Amino acid sequence: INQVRPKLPLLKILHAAGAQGEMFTVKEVMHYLGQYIMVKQLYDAAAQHMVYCGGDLLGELLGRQSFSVKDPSPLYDMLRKNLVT
Structure with missing residues (x-):
């Protein structure tokens, strides 16, 4: 498994969600990214699968006004541009 260092715009989100490190796994980043969605309550509470x-x-990082967790390919696109292998 490859270790990754999130860039400062994503390390900011990651630490906010409860992390502290600079070397992670993609699985971890994914975990913290959902933790951040919860703690900022970014989801529709009448559609908890649509993240606003x-x-x-x-959103600035993703370039998305909103998205569903049915298709988290936006997240994957954004991790390619914000993690250093």
């Missing part, structure tokens, strides 16, 4: 990330740095 627009007035939040996760």
